[PDB]
From a paper:
Bacterial cell division is a fundamental process that results in the physical separation of a mother cell into two daughter cells and involves a set of proteins known as the divisome. Early and late components are linked by the FtsQBL complex, which is well-conserved among bacteria. The FtsQBL complex may have a structural role as a scaffold in the assembly of the divisome since FtsB and FtsL proteins are recruited to the divisome by FtsQ and the resulting FtsQBL complex then recruits late divisome components. In this study, we have determined the crystal structure of the periplasmic domain of FtsQ in complex with C-terminal fragment of FtsB, showing that the C-terminal region of FtsB is a key binding region of FtsQ.
To gain further insights into structural organization of the FtsQB complex, we determined the 2.9-Å resolution structure of FtsQ50–276 bound to FtsB25–103. The electron density map of residues 25–60 was not observed for FtsB25–103, while nearly all sequences of FtsQ50–276 were found to be ordered with the exception of N- and C-terminal flexible regions (residues 50–52 and 262–276, respectively). The overall structure of FtsQ50–276 consists of two domains, α and β, and the β-domain is responsible for FtsB25–103 binding. The solvent-accessible surface area buried at the interface between FtsQ and FtsB was 1330 Å2, approximately 20% of the monomer surface area of FtsQ. The FtsB sequence (residues 61–95) folds into one α-helix (α3) and one β-strand (β1). The α-helix-turn-β-strand motif begins with the α-helix (residues 64–75), followed by a kinked loop (residues 76–82), a short β-strand (residues 83–85), and another terminal kinked loop (residues 86–95); the two kinked loops contain two proline residues (Pro80 and Pro89). The kinked loop between the α-helix (residues 64–75) and β-strand (residues 83–85) wraps around the Tyr248 residue of FtsQ. To stabilize the kinked loop conformation, four FtsB residues (Glu68, Arg72, Arg79, and Glu82) form a cluster with extensive salt-bridge networks. Interestingly, the β-strand of FtsB makes a continuous β-sheet with that of FtsQ by anti-parallel stacking with β12. The charge reversal mutations E69R, R72E, and E82R of FtsB nearly abolished binding to FtsQ. This highlights the role of FtsQ Tyr248 and the FtsB α-helix-turn-β-strand motif as affinity determinants.
Numbering used by the authors:
A (entry chain A): 4 to 212
B (entry chain B): 272 to 306
The structure:
């Protein structure tokens, strides 16, 4: 008959961690059996590598028989360049796509190191847009620093390189007119392209049947 | 150079050119379609 000898207790809010992932970290280590002597700090520096979604690992031991591991995961705000994530402060990490993956998370895009930059804009435009009835599905910065936002609809907004808060300002002012014209013709606004002092060019599309 | 994007960025901003099919709205003060 089986019953435990070394116990393992995990604490803190955890969405992306399976309990087995920590177990597999300690066990897949060296000299398995030196289990509450293998340095409490070495076990931090092992949970951290094997899991890039842990912000922090807090390991102590409680004599006689248990190992108490406190975890803080990275809370992502966006899906960066399709294959990473990012949290409020700009930190980029990853997860298995085997994991939740049916998340209502926006997706940011941009050059290699620009995940904090893109986050900046994503906050500043998502803010003003949510001040009206609009949420950001995507937001893509190019190398040249030209922003293109896909919206809650599949309405893309090409804001170019310049007066961006002025330009999606101008879109919010216009949206009613666009919706009116959108039905009196029975087409959906595909994009509105704002690279104009004072102007906007709208491309329309047919609509799902 | 910028290629096809910096060319298009310019044509819109400096010339107010559009693409085939797009409706244009200017805001010399108020919104206004081609009409
Ligand atoms: Mg900005
Ligand atoms: Mg521009």
């Amino acid at each position: 008959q089986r019953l435990p000898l070394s116990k393992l207790v995990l604490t803190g809010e955890r969405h992306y961690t399976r309990n087995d992932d920590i177990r597999q970290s300690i066990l897949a280590l060296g000299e398995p059996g030196t289990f509450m002597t293998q340095d409490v700090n070495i076990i931090q520096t092992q949970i951290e590598q094997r899991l890039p979604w842990i912000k922090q690992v807090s390991v102590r031991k409680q004599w006689p028989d248990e190992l108490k591991i406190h975890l803080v995961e990275y809370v992502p705000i966006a899906r960066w360049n399709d294959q990473h994530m990012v949290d409020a402060e700009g930190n980029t990490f990853s997860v298995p796509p085997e994991r939740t993956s049916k998340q209502v998370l926006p997706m940011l895009y941009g050059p290699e190191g620009s995940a904090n930059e893109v986050l900046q804009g994503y906050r500043e435009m998502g803010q003003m847009l949510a001040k009206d009835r609009f949420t950001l599905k995507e937001a893509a910065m190019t190398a040249r620093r030209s922003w293109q936002l896909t919206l809650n609809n599949d309405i893309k907004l090409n804001l170019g390189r310049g007066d961006t808060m002025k330009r999606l300002a101008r879109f919010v002012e216009l949206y009613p007119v666009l919706q009116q014209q959108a039905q009196t013709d029975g087409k959906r606004i595909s994009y509105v392209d704002l690279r104009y002092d004072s102007g906007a060019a709208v491309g329309w599309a047919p609509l799902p049947p | 150079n910028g290629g096809q994007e910096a060319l298009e960025e310019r044509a819109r901003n400096e010339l107010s050119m559009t693409r085939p099919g797009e409706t244009f709205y200017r805001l010399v003060p108020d919104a206004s379609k081609r009409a």
